Amino acid sequence: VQLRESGPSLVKPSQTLSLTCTVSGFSLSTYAVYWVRQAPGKALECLGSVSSGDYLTYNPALKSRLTITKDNSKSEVSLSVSTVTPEDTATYYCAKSHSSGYNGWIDFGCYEFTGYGPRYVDAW
Amino acid sequence: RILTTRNGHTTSTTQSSVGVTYGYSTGEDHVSGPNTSGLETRVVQAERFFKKHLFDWTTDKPFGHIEKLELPTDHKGVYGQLVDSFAYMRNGWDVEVSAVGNQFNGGCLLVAMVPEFKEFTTREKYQLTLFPHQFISPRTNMTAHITVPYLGVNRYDQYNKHKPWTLVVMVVSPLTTSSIGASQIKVYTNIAPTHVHVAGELPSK
Amino acid sequence: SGNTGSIINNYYMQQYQNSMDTQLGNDWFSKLASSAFTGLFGALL
Amino acid sequence: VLTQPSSVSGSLGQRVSITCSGSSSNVGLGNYVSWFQQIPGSAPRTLIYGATNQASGVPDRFSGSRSGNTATLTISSLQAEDEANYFCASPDSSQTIFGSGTTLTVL
Amino acid sequence: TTATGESADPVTTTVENYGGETQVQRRHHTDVSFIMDRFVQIKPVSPTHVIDLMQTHQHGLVGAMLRAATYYFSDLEIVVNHTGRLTWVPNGAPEAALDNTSNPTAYHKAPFTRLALPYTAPHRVLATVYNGNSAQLPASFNYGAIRATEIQELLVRMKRAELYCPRPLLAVKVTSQDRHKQKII
Amino acid sequence: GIVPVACSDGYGGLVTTDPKTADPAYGMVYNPPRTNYPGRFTNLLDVAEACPTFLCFDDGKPYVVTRADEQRLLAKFDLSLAAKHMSNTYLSGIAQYYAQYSGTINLHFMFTGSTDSKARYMVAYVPPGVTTPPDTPERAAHCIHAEWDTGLNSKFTFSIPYVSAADYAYTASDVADTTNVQGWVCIYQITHGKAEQDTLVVSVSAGKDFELRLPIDPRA
């Protein structure tokens, strides 16, 4: 169970970018994938989470600049950050949950990253 | 202010109940209708409380963390056997949900019965109080009792094909756990079907 | 009634203009909003 | 925002404790803190999930406990090979916040 | 007034509470028949467009104010702008019956043609959200199915509409401001 | 001053089902008078209710022959009016035009065998809550059913109760829905004595509470 992400090169400021996180030996129908990035010299920052039942949660600040799409059959998660700025330069991680994560439209950061007993985190 | 309800032969008394709230009606609409041509027989062996466990109210869950139970839920009781053996049945939902806390933790939880429940949008959750509902908080009442008459487009609808009422529990305020207060609060529902009728006896295997 | 405002008996009978309605021999939210606890709850000064 | 010491140095064979300082809104809100150890140039591993239970496939030497508003990750008999950056993932109000991170050096 | 407020008792407090006086209210324009008896455009209209509500755009007046109620019941007054003979069938008719001209058809009048088709669905009262299949709402809910050579526009008007079981109405989202701040007339 | 009509636009176009009568283009003519003419029927439904019609079956024969094998179910058919078994019957034909129907449907079974041959038949109506109707009468005994012995009175009439989630059920089953809108009706022969090569005639007629509405004219 390994996660592989594909990222572009330098993206010009004021453009979008599409990163695709390709799961392996993984359900994506009973598990959830999150998107976390680390701007250098800063702490990690939850971008957004896609649950098992394709319900999405987004970082309140980077919300409206960001979309996340999941396809269970093709078994790949996608991230599209619109309006890229020089501040958004970072290394972008995708993670696994240990549970489905909230199938609601909760509106929190990830919402499940360190929730309770059942759902915590999985091999990035 | 105790309240000692009763359904069939089981009773549930809560000494912290704040009041029964009827949803959309007080008494169910007429039962013998153009359909079933009078083949409906009111079953009463099925008005019985059946416990169900729900989400363990934990402080981690933020505002808008709705937990939904669809009624009627899988039942191993007489009512569960009745839905399997009867093609069409109608019953009042009468949902009762009790969350027990030490009362030193302040958390506001909204429990509502919503007909034709749909994934509710985050913005819709703010306006979720329109449906019959009660607020469960450790500070005053640990038990919420809601009585809702069964309402459906058809007079009788097969429960397996479609379920009209889904109990929804929403954490309006994240539980404020304190050293004196309970670390986490569980949420159990004492649901009971009321005015349960059936029709069209269905052949068993 | 609704948005009808013409002061004249409708030309067509009810059966043809609208779908006649049957009964089985209300306004719950008006009942609710009317049974609405108003005023104070304790002694006023 | 889950501030942690920039650099923590522990002599090999000596127990080392990493402290993640958090506010009442996030770390203090509940005992649901996740600790992630990330080796430079590789994906991070969740050493502790829920702040009281070691994750499956993780060494038993790591011990996790949270008191008040501060969550502390303790490593016993720390080894030079296992040295890596440590992040104290926790849940804030309306978002998930991750600790700045602590650099681990073995003398 | 400090009610119990966790028993969900409608407690409405008037301005008399603090030496005021509450005026008279006239709520004719927020009645649920007068606010529904106005037309609304259904898009997109193809030939054999099944004439059911909830095709109306979510945010339009009759659209949202309807989705604010689970179960609705109304008689329509359809307004079609077609290019040929326009046939409407009761909600149960097979699609084949849309060409047979003995069921209600309206011949091209020069402008659009206005027809007042009754409520033909079999269900007691329709629904806006259905829970469980038969999760999409069933075919039976549709009021009626129309068909013409081509249908340019189509308006729908719910006469003697009566709604039930209210639902969230969802006013426009606003961020980074205190009011919505739209260009007013 | 001439009154201003202010005639409306987009309405008043001639409609095939429009109620308004056409303007007279000829003078009053007195037609030949018929008083109490025989066989006049005011309502189509009354004619269907008054006279039962036969149902189609394997080999296109209305009578259902006694099984020559150990099977107690002579025939099982869908309650929906647009069914192969009821396609031939007159009641389905009048009902085919109406969009939806309501009320009990009466089934008339009349034994057509020699006096020496005696058989017992059970007609059971099964609601649509199961994938398929049972092949055994005891399994189908739980649902509404009528068992009639064959004696001096050859014809036994069983009224099928109409029970459905919808108040009115569409006469024609949707192509998309493989299962019937209404539950299957099954006719069974629990006991047959010397009934080899014996035929039982079954007919279907409109019930007292049976009614139809929203009439349309689709291709038949």
Numbering used by the authors:
A (entry chain H): 2 to 125
B (entry chain 2): 13 to 217
C (entry chain 4): 15 to 39, 65 to 84
D (entry chain L): 5 to 111
E (entry chain 1): 1 to 134, 155 to 205
F (entry chain 3): 1 to 220
Original paper wording:
Foot-and-mouth disease virus (FMDV) serotype A is antigenically most variable within serotypes. Neutralizing antibodies (NAbs) provided vital protection against FMDV and concurrently driven viral evolution under immune pressure in bovine. Thus, we determined the structures of A/WH/CHA/09 in complex with W125 scFv (FMDV-AWH-W125) and W2 scFv (FMDV-AWH-W2), respectively. The cryo-EM reconstruction showed that three-molecule W125 scFv and W2 scFv were both bound to the FMDV-AWH capsid around icosahedral threefold axis, but with W125 positioned closer to the center of threefold axis compared to W2 scattering around it.
The final resolution of the cryo-EM reconstruction was estimated by the gold standard Fourier shell correlation (FSC) = 0.143 criterion to be 3.75 Å for the FMDV-AWH-W2 complex and 3.72 Å for the FMDV-AWH-W125 complex. As revealed in FMDV-AWH-W125 complex, W125 contacts with the βB and BC/EF/HI-loops of VP2, the B-B knob and HI-loop of VP3 within one protomer. Residues in VP2 βB (VP2D68), BC-loop (VP2T70, VP2T71, VP2K73 and VP2H77), EF-loop (VP2E131 and VP2K137) and HI-loop (VP2Q196) interact with residues in heavy chain complementarity-determining region 3 (HCDR3) (VHY117, VHR120, VHY112 and VHY103) and LCDR1 (VLY36). Meanwhile, residues in the VP3 B-B knob (VP3K61 and VP3Y63) and HI-loop (VP3Q197) interact with residues in light chain CDR3 (LCDR3) (VLS97) and LCDR1 (VLS28). Mutations at positions 70, 71, 77 and 196 on VP2 as well as position 61 on VP3 significantly reduced antibody neutralization. Meanwhile, the sequence alignment of A/WH/CHA/09, A/GDMM/2013 and A/AF72 shows that the common residues (VP2T70, VP2H77, VP2Q196, and VP3K61) that contact W125 are strictly conserved. The conservation of all residues appeared more than 95% in available FMDV serotype A sequences, indicating that these highly conserved interaction residues may be the key determinants for conserved antigenic structure on FMDV serotype A. The antigenic structure resolved by FMDV-AWH-W125 complex indicate the conserved antigenic site 2. However, the FMDV-AWH-W125 complex structure revealed an additional key 61 residue on the VP3 B-B knob, along with the interface residues on B-C/H-I loops of VP2. Structure comparisons of FMDV-integrin and FMDV-mAbs show obvious clashes between mAbs (W2 and W125) and the integrin receptor, suggesting that FMDV neutralization by W2 and W125 is facilitated by blocking virus-receptor interaction via steric hindrance.
